Design a protein around this ligand. Structure first.
Ligand SMILES: *C(=C)C1=C(C)[C@@H](Cc2[nH]c(/C=C3N=C(/C=C4\NC(=O)[C@H](C)[C@H]4CC)C(C)=C\3CCC(=O)O)c(CCC(=O)O)c2C)NC1=O
Ligand SMILES: *C(=C)C1=C(C)[C@@H](Cc2[nH]c(/C=C3N=C(/C=C4\NC(=O)[C@H](C)[C@H]4CC)C(C)=C\3CCC(=O)O)c(CCC(=O)O)c2C)NC1=O
Ligand SMILES: *C(=C)C1=C(C)[C@@H](Cc2[nH]c(/C=C3N=C(/C=C4\NC(=O)[C@H](C)[C@H]4CC)C(C)=C\3CCC(=O)O)c(CCC(=O)O)c2C)NC1=O
Ligand SMILES: *[C@@H](C)[C@H]1/C(=C/C2=NC(=C\c3[nH]c(C[C@H]4NC(=O)C(C=C)=C4C)c(C)c3CCC(=O)O)/C(CCC(=O)O)=C2C)NC(=O)[C@@H]1C
Ligand SMILES: *[C@H](C)[C@H]1/C(=C/C2=NC(=C\c3[nH]c(C[C@H]4NC(=O)C(C=C)=C4C)c(C)c3CCC(=O)O)/C(CCC(=O)O)=C2C)NC(=O)[C@@H]1C
Ligand SMILES: *[C@H](C)[C@H]1/C(=C/C2=NC(=C\c3[nH]c(C[C@H]4NC(=O)C(C=C)=C4C)c(C)c3CCC(=O)O)/C(CCC(=O)O)=C2C)NC(=O)[C@@H]1C
Ligand SMILES: *[C@H](C)[C@H]1/C(=C/C2=NC(=C\c3[nH]c(C[C@H]4NC(=O)C(C=C)=C4C)c(C)c3CCC(=O)O)/C(CCC(=O)O)=C2C)NC(=O)[C@@H]1C
Ligand SMILES: *[C@H](C)[C@H]1/C(=C/C2=NC(=C\c3[nH]c(C[C@H]4NC(=O)C(C=C)=C4C)c(C)c3CCC(=O)O)/C(CCC(=O)O)=C2C)NC(=O)[C@@H]1C
Ligand SMILES: *[C@H](C)[C@H]1/C(=C/C2=NC(=C\c3[nH]c(C[C@H]4NC(=O)C(C=C)=C4C)c(C)c3CCC(=O)O)/C(CCC(=O)O)=C2C)NC(=O)[C@@H]1C
Ligand SMILES: C=CC1=C(C)[C@@H](Cc2[nH]c(/C=C3N=C(/C=C4\NC(=O)[C@H](C)[C@H]4CC)C(C)=C\3CCC(=O)O)c(CCC(=O)O)c2C)NC1=O
Ligand SMILES: C=CC1=C(C)[C@@H](Cc2[nH]c(/C=C3N=C(/C=C4\NC(=O)[C@H](C)[C@H]4CC)C(C)=C\3CCC(=O)O)c(CCC(=O)O)c2C)NC1=O
Ligand SMILES: C=CC1=C(C)[C@@H](Cc2[nH]c(/C=C3N=C(/C=C4\NC(=O)[C@H](C)[C@H]4CC)C(C)=C\3CCC(=O)O)c(CCC(=O)O)c2C)NC1=O
Ligand SMILES: CCC1=C(C)/C(=C/C2=NC(=C\c3[nH]c(/C=C4\NC(=O)[C@H](C)[C@H]4CC)c(C)c3CCC(=O)O)/C(CCC(=O)O)=C2C)NC1=O
Lengths: 249, 103, 161, 177, 160, 177, 177, 177
């Protein structure tokens, strides 16, 4: 019965339960009139006809705004993977909706549709078939390599905060000076190359052409933090195989 | 070697954990009960490295310098025709660090 | 101080051998890349000041060695850096032409890490200054030429470590 | 959701007690300063479009890797969904400033937000220093000390409303940490 | 030597200045499991607290070359390269450095530096242990705090 | 009602299978000397962690070369794997003591073990040495003749079940020989 | 003690934030249970001044010939040395519990210990009793099942940390047997 | 015993010289700060009975195995002796801060105290932790930054006398280590 109320939000509305209050309403609609009263609660709703209307087949909805945030993680847990059926799966949503069991981040990646470009493309198929003891060792290290990389990214943020306080007596002291250039602003003066910028000198980004003590420690942050992001997914697909090391076990 | 098909993927499942909770029924569970693990292997499945990397230095060739003239350590393939051998030996020396054949 | 074609005239020769097919096989491999190395050393000579200006602004300014108390504070100390980084970009150019890193440890690496510890120069920031300098050098000379010039930068970074 | 008066009822419901006379002394001083609370959320909602563009584009000033290729604020679908998310956080902070209690922020916005951002590939450290620019913007708009826009208020002291909306913003950064 | 290499302090004692290191043998580090000293030092085992680890290791470096023979019944203090004073006291052939109780007399080093083996780890004087990582807690309600602030009519005794 | 155990054990389904009240007295009438036998497995599994950490260590206390560098109870993953294997045989003896048959202990836990321990290089004489300690404990816990502990039981005799638990432990040592 | 985890260096002029070439992967993955481990070593070393007096007097009251004249703990030099060897063993177990491997135990403490005690005439059959009391003492603290002292903790499980520290105490006792 | 005057006598006796004008400036500056030193001892003596109960009980709440049976602060004779040697050590430090030289601290207080505490079986780890709580009080009383008792002193500086008494308690803690 607990699995039957789960799928009716997915098969008919195309989402999860928003919270435990909306899910416990539908056990009272079943308690009043049974199956066909509970089934007609979705098709006779204003949320149905404002989205699907009378003409569209229902689908799993990926909108943007999600008035509980925890219902986004639950709909990716419920509808996850293109080749996955609902036959003989266990019940998934009572313990996320009561904040008992957190949804693991690899179970949301199975629910999301696949983009072409990631920053860190996944090793979902590129993990080798090693044992449970080496794979657990493989996953723990990925979390371990997020912990020392986090506390040297925090040391980079304290150096950015120290670099701005170093120059803040002069950054505000030059903010009420009259700095008039010789060219570049009005078009009646010959500026040459600096009508805009000339011939390839804009850069790959635009912020790399700006010099300064706080721009130079910021590029240290982006090389220290992109690495952290890529390692976060390495503990995701180490964990996810763990789900299939255990779920099939 | 994995000869363990006789121990299948229901391996360390540990059926007989039994909790009586009074005078009432046994209450048999199925808990796997993992160890104080650690699974010690080297060279795991991914890189786990940030750029912060220049650790590589060559091997010590003795007193010469590294990568130092070990044309004694390097291969080579020919000898010549009129080479004739030596009487005294004074056996194998080191790398004669300074001054390579092109001093 | 040996180049490629002069390291094979030690190995084919310190044991007293001749130049067989294997010794000439590597020599032909060096002559094939002879055209690539000169153009690599060409542009590096042109953009010597620009490369060093790009490396320091991309890596070691940004971190309180540049500020007071840091290892690079005074103008004499700052000026010693770009003088110091010029040798790494220059001697790496020599290794890229000679095709053999023997000149680096002969004239750069020996007594180098033992000297920075005396002065108290941070070896950690130095390697970053060379890694960033290696990154911009791959911009100019291209990919494979950057692979060649980059192969001697980390040789300096390895031994200097 | 709860507000400031539903919060004191569920404390009194825990002991099955009536809301008496001594705890009505503090509720009457909440409603006496209720005109400063409406005068404070009006200084945030009036400035709310420039608050999430000073903050998201100030997050890029401290991280150029977001606008590098592959980055999180790189393409136009990804910058639009970050400027969307920065004003959802400003919307639920202003709800809890209006309601007097942070219960609508903790379960409708901040619950499950961290592991949402792991799964999409969002850098959570860049969100913490994005919502901390909006924290410093809000406490400059409450206390009328922004440098480019001054508003016209009556005379007095709104420092307790400034550190109540500051504590709603370091409750966000404790959830995505 | 391993804590020096990780903590970055080892660059400091690379320098040519005449130092007097009081490097504790690892039995001293192994003796850090005192119910007392584990309170103020176990928190450094966390991987983010390299901050105090430099400040506790830098208390063992003394500017100058103080050999044990130079401490013939002499009590002289000095501050470390950490920045806080330490009292080296040599009396009855028992040379002390704070709570050191030096084991091996001296080791001659490269730049005229000396190395003494100590029996324990010297903690700096005004060193407070870093607290454990905690939970950022937020006020459950707003009306439990307006009720927590004394009104002006309360401060003058006009009300209870 | 014995199949619902078996369903949990052999059929790998339902996990707890926790016998209620009216299902209990049908089991006690079905199992001969059931009030002694349900005290017999209660005297084992309430002392389960105490019996393992003797029996793994008492193997090392008589054979000290296993924790030498080169022995098999060196390298802590292998030392913990010996303690899990010692815990598994202690459990699966007690299900055979509960169900009254050595059939479920043989196929699930014991078939192929002799080929397993020679494939990993496990010294198979010491495993018989380890289970002889667990043979010596379980006759002492059932008869309430344990040394530092004594249990408060209903009075009587349990020597017939103590011989029955002797006939399960040597079947392990007859298999891994 | 301070080698038992791996911290991270973030400042300049370090030589390890840039050129160090390694985060310690086997020690970056031991803070992944590290709050549970640091509470477990805090159970022992806040009771180690009581653990060594209970264990040494445990073998005196179980074997009264050691405080006999002619026994090995009669003189005050020998009674002080027997209390010192129990604390030093308890610290090096608490190294190996903290570091997670028994390499530091078998290098500084256990290497050449059986040859020490048979050269000094120390009885080895009584000395392993004093370690095995501390084996039974340390599992009561880590599982928090000690009788006359409990400690406050966070809610959870600490098996396979009491079972880890039982794997070091027999490793002491078999190296001296 | 010696003091701050007779220390530079026996240092000038070693060079066989007279106490000239280059060594009287070490003494005439010492007497010019003589009123500061007498105001520095009076912060200790006026709180001498409550500092020893502040420090021995802080050793107990950090190391609770001393009050367990089998400990070393268990009985009333053992607790009162531990309140005795907290203040007997504080008696000689207050002499040695008054005299200006640690000769009285290293010939009466520390005159074989490490040989006493071994032969008494006193845990030396807990006594280093006591002594040092009295060090952390004395640098708060001399600098007048104790959190609960302020004494009225004329303004100035006592960082020299605070660091002098911090070197007398470390000397005690170096020798009983
Ligand atoms: C790079 C080019 C770049 C930055 C770096 C970053 C600068 C920055 N600014 C703040 C603070 C504010 N932004 C504010 C917003 C506005 N000011 C206005 O008056 C209008 C209404 C509005 C814009 C539409 C405000 C009010 C502040 C507060 C300061 C003040 O008192 O004026 C920060 C926050 C500091 C922190 O991290 O805590 C930073 C870094 N913006 C860039 O574009
Ligand atoms: C003499 C005949 C004799 C003793 C002396 C005494 C020593 C002893 N104690 C145990 C078992 C434990 N000892 C423990 C230690 C302590 N308990 C405390 O509360 C304080 C902190 C500390 C002592 C200062 C603990 C926790 C145990 C475990 C049992 C329990 O929970 O109490 C033994 C071993 C006995 C066994 O393993 O069965 C010995 C020898 N006992 C004596 O008989
Ligand atoms: C137990 C867990 C525990 C304690 C008991 C307590 C003991 C303690 N106190 C300090 C610091 C000071 N102790 C002082 C002593 C006293 N205060 C007084 O004014 C009188 C003289 C006496 C009490 C009768 C003083 C003056 C200080 C300095 C600060 C101040 O202004 O009070 C310590 C050392 C610091 C520390 O490690 O906490 C200890 C152990 N603290 C406990 O944790
Ligand atoms: C702190 C945030 C400010 C500040 C606040 C004060 N506001 C005061 C009075 C005030 N504000 C409003 C308008 C407000 N009420 C509404 O109904 C709406 C929108 C529909 C808004 C924006 C009113 C009506 C009042 C007057 C109430 C009254 O005077 O009775 C005020 C005066 C004292 C007080 O009301 O308690 C203060 C201090 N002023 C500041 O200086 C900082 C910047
Ligand atoms: C053998 C190991 C023991 C022993 C066993 C006996 N127990 C007897 C009666 C009895 N046993 C239990 C516990 C057991 N029965 C249950 O139903 C459940 C679970 C719900 C358990 C754990 C109970 C409750 C009783 C009844 C006691 C009473 O009436 O108060 C018993 C008597 C004969 C019999 O009933 O079979 C024996 C011999 N006694 C021993 O002497 C050894 C050590
Ligand atoms: C095992 C013997 C105990 C037990 C352990 C748990 N501790 C948990 C969390 C925890 N413990 C500490 C203190 C510890 N961490 C440190 O960094 C230091 C010293 C500097 C110490 C002593 C902290 C700070 C925390 C985190 C608090 C929190 O976030 O809740 C814990 C839960 C987390 C986990 O399982 O990983 C457990 C189980 N608890 C027990 O019941 C047994 C007896
Ligand atoms: C311990 C007292 C022994 C000893 C034990 C080791 N066993 C190791 C691995 C292992 N053992 C089994 C059989 C066991 N596990 C089960 O799940 C069941 C039944 C439910 C039983 C009887 C298995 C399946 C395995 C794992 C084999 C595999 O994964 O392929 C082991 C590890 C070997 C290693 O990692 O090198 C040890 C050390 N060895 C001893 O020295 C004593 C005598
Ligand atoms: C007490 C539970 C024992 C016992 C202890 C005695 N040990 C004696 C001397 C001794 N013990 C050790 C080993 C200890 N020192 C270490 O440094 C380490 C590990 C790092 C350990 C385990 C050594 C090296 C020595 C000799 C030097 C010394 O005196 O410390 C001893 C004195 C013997 C004598 O002087 O006649 C005793 C009594 N002996 C016992 O009977 C119980 C079982
Ligand atoms: C308390 C903070 C300690 C601790 C102290 C105990 N001392 C015991 C006896 C004792 N204490 C001293 C120290 C003291 N007396 C002096 O004359 C001097 C300086 C010259 C000092 C520092 C001495 C010498 C003695 C032996 C005296 C005697 O008993 O005749 C004692 C009781 C032992 C007993 O009654 O036999 C205790 C408990 N013990 C602790 O646990 C903390 C660390
Ligand atoms: C209830 C509250 C609530 C929220 C807080 C947001 C949370 C949120 N953000 C995104 C989605 C996203 N969020 C970001 C955000 C960022 N990348 C960055 O550079 C910054 C650090 C950061 C914010 C400025 C991006 C870039 C996406 C789109 C992912 C992509 O297509 O690349 C999604 C997925 C939406 C979808 O695609 O359907 C959700 C649920 N939504 C909510 O309903
Ligand atoms: C949970 C609490 C609990 C215990 C601690 C044990 C205690 C215990 N140990 C044994 C019995 C034993 N116990 C051990 C274990 C050890 N012996 C040694 O040599 C070392 C001191 C130690 C390993 C460290 C051994 C080796 C035997 C004897 C087994 C045999 O017959 O060979 C017996 C059986 C005696 C009998 O049945 O009458 C008992 C009750 N049992 C329990 O129920
Ligand atoms: C018979 C007993 C006896 C005493 C108790 C002292 C009493 C005493 N203290 C000071 C005087 C002083 N005492 C201090 C000391 C301090 N002030 C601070 O702010 C610090 C907290 C603390 C440092 C330890 C200072 C700074 C002076 C004044 C300067 C000086 O005398 O050198 C003076 C000189 C000024 C005066 O006349 O009051 C005297 C007599 N002398 C004695 O003969
Ligand atoms: C105490 C002696 C001393 C000096 C002088 C010093 C200068 C110094 N000037 C710098 C940058 C800079 N300096 C300027 C300066 C100027 N632009 C102009 O148009 C003007 C002509 C001129 C100032 C009057 C600029 C624009 C930068 C940043 C350059 C860049 O970002 O590429 C930097 C790099 C960033 C930093 O760490 O601050 C240093 C170290 N350091 C020292 O230790």
């Amino acid at each position: 019965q607990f699995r039957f109320i789960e799928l009716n939000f997915k098969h008919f509305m195309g989402r999860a339960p928003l919270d435990m209050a909306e899910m416990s309403k539908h056990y009272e609609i079943f308690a009043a009139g049974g199956y066909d009263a509970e089934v007609d609660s979705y098709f006779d709703s204003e949320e149905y006809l404002d989205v699907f209307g009378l003409d569209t087949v229902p689908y799993m909805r990926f909108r943007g705004t999600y008035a509980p945030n925890s219902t986004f993680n639950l709909q990716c847990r419920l509808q996850g993977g293109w080749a996955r059926s609902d036959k003989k799966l266990p019940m998934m949503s009572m313990l996320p909706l009561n904040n008992k069991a957190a949804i693991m981040p690899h179970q949301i990646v199975d629910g999301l549709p696949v983009i072409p470009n990631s920053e860190h493309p996944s090793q979902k198929y590129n993990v080798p078939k090693v044992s449970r003891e080496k794979l657990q060792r493989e996953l723990l290290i990925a979390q371990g390599k997020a912990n020392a990389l986090q506390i040297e990214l925090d040391a980079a943020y304290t150096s950015l905060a120290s670099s701005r306080a170093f120059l803040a007596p002069f950054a505000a002291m030059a903010a009420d000076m009259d700095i008039r250039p010789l060219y570049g602003k009005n078009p009646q003066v010959f500026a040459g190359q600096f009508l805009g910028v000339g011939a390839g000198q804009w850069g790959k980004t635009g912020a790399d052409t700006v010099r300064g003590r706080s721009r130079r420690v910021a590029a240290d942050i982006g090389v220290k933090e992109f690495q952290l992001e890529r390692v976060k997914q390495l503990v995701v697909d180490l964990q996810r195989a763990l789900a299939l090391e255990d779920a099939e076990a | 070697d994995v000869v363990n098909a006789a121990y299948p993927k229901n391996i360390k499942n540990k059926a007989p954990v039994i909790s009586f909770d009074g005078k009432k029924g046994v209450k048999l569970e199925m808990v796997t009960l993992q160890t104080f693990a650690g699974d010690d292997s080297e060279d795991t499945l991914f890189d786990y490295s940030s750029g912060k990397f220049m650790p590589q230095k060559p091997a010590d060739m003795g007193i010469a310098w590294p990568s130092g003239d070990g044309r004694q350590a390097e291969m080579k393939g020919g000898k010549g025709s009129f080479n004739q051998p030596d009487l005294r030996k004074y056996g194998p020396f080191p790398d004669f660090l300074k001054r390579s054949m092109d001093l | 101080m040996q180049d490629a074609i002069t390291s094979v005239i030690n190995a084919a020769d310190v044991q007293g051998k001749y130049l067989d097919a294997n010794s000439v096989e590597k020599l032909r491999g060096y002559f094939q890349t002879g055209e690539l190395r000169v153009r690599a050393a060409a542009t590096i000579a042109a953009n010597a000041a620009t490369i060093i200006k790009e490396a320091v602004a991309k890596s070691l300014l940004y971190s309180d060695i540049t500020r007071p108390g840091g290892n690079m504070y005074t103008t004499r100390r700052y000026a010693a850096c770009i003088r110091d980084l010029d040798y790494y970009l220059r001697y790496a150019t020599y290794g890229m032409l000679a095709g053999d890193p023997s000149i680096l440890d002969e004239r750069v690496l020996n007594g180098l890490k033992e000297t920075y510890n005396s002065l108290g120069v941070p070896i950690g920031a130095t390697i970053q200054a060379i890694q960033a300098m290696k990154e911009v050098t791959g911009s100019l000379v291209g990919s494979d030429a950057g692979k060649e010039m980059g192969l001697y930068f980390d040789y300096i970074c390895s031994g200097l470590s | 959701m709860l507000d400031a008066f539903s919060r004191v009822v569920v404390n009194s419901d825990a002991k099955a007690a009536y809301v008496g006379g001594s705890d009505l002394q503090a509720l009457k001083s909440f409603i006496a300063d209720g005109n400063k609370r409406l005068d404070a959320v009006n200084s945030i909602v009036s400035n709310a479009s420039c608050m999430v563009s000073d903050a998201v584009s100030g997050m890029i000033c401290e991280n150029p890797g977001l606008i590098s290729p592959g980055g999180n604020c790189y393409t136009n679908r990804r910058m639009a969904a970050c400027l969307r998310d920065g004003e959802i956080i400003l919307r639920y902070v202003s709800y809890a400033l209006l309601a007097g209690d942070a219960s609508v922020l903790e379960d409708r916005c901040l619950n499950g937000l961290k592991e949402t951002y792991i799964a999409l590939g969002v850098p959570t450290n860049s969100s913490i220093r994005a919502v901390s620019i909006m924290k410093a913007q809000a406490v400059a708009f409450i206390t009328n000390t922004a440098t480019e826009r001054k508003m016209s208020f009556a005379a007095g002291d709104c420092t307790s409303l400034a550190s109540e909306v500051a504590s709603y913003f370091d409750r966000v950064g404790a959830a995505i940490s | 030597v391993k804590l020096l290499n990780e903590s970055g302090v080892e660059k400091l004692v690379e320098q040519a200045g005449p130092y007097t290191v009081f490097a504790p043998t690892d039995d001293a580090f192994a003796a850090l499991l005192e119910p007392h000293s584990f309170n103020k030092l176990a928190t450094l085992l966390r991987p983010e607290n390299n901050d105090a680890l430099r400040k506790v290791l830098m208390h063992h470096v003394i500017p100058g070359a103080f050999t044990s023979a130079s401490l013939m019944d002499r009590a002289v203090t000095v501050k470390s390269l950490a920045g806080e004073p330490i009292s080296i006291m040599g009396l009855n052939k028992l040379v002390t450095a704070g709570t050191a109780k030096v084991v091996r007399a001296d080791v001659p080093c490269a730049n005229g530096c000396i190395i003494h083996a100590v029996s324990s780890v010297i903690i700096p004087p005004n060193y407070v242990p870093v607290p454990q990582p905690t939970k950022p807690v937020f006020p459950r309600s707003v009306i439990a705090e307006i009720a927590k602030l004394p009104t002006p009519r309360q401060a003058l005794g006009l009300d209870p």
